Design a protein around this ligand. Sequence first.
Ligand SMILES: CN(CCOc1ccc(C[C@H](Nc2ccccc2C(=O)c2ccccc2)C(=O)O)cc1)c1ccccn1
Ligand SMILES: [Cl-]
Ligand SMILES: [Cl-]
Ligand SMILES: [Cl-]
Lengths: 267, 11
Amino acid sequence: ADLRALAKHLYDSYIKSFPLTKAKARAILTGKTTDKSPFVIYDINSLMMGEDKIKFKHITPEQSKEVAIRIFQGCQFRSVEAVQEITEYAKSIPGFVNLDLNDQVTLLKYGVHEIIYTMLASLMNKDGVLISEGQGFMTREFLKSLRKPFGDFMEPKFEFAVKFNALELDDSDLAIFIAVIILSGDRPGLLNVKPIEDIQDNLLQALELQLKLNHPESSQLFAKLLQKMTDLRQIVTEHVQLLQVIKKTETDMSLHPLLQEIYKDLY
Amino acid sequence: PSLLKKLLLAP
Ligand SMILES: CN(CCOc1ccc(C[C@H](Nc2ccccc2C(=O)c2ccccc2)C(=O)O)cc1)c1ccccn1
Ligand SMILES: [Cl-]
Ligand SMILES: [Cl-]
Ligand SMILES: [Cl-]
């Protein structure tokens, strides 16, 4: 009912759940920060020099792996942490923890990657992506140069991010949008859709109001953003097909058990 | 054991 209070509560939760916000990412990417700039990774040599400073060092033991595998393992490290952050955020969405525990799982199973790709755009420009909470920056050209199918994974996300960043959403817009994605009543296998839709109705109302107030000169920003939600699903589909190529062709490339659980029987 | 449930039920 109180759409401005819901909006504010979601933003406060977002600030607590996600260490690198869009505001902070954009301050780094435009130099308007007093911390020292990210370490730029543009090739295998810069990767070896920089990886000791990057958070995914926590999981690096063993003989040297080729560059495409290192990137794969470090991105897997980040994806597992991102899932844990999004799950903490989801538990703050009012009504979410009162849903059937099995529907909570289903909402997260089908929603986290759509959310990951949404917020990945906050860390990207057309030429690279911030990693390790802004301590590193990995160039788009370097990620593209990786041998197939590794060099194919990031390009569709950069493409998405350039179009999406053109909406110029901020963190208070994004906090509501990602809640709307999680509360999607049409996920396969949901046991009880009505209470999920009721929550999303309120969230969609809160989002529409937020967008009208925060971006008065963008008419139909709300309509535009809703059309992106559906594009996110195609990104996941294509990503899954790329991971399946890895699974059938590479050796010793099993996924983290959390990522296996999400991907198992996904659609 | 579901790991998503573990994250969801964690304090
Ligand atoms: C690109 N980047 C920022 C985070 O990007 C994400 C890009 C995608 C994801 C989702 C995640 N992806 C993977 C999961 C396991 C292993 C690799 C990937 C890749 O997506 C991948 C594969 C090949 C080449 C490059 C990436 C998922 O499906 O769960 C999560 C995060 C990195 C890269 C290296 C180290 C840290 N930060
Ligand atoms: Cl951009
Ligand atoms: Cl505006
Ligand atoms: Cl691996």
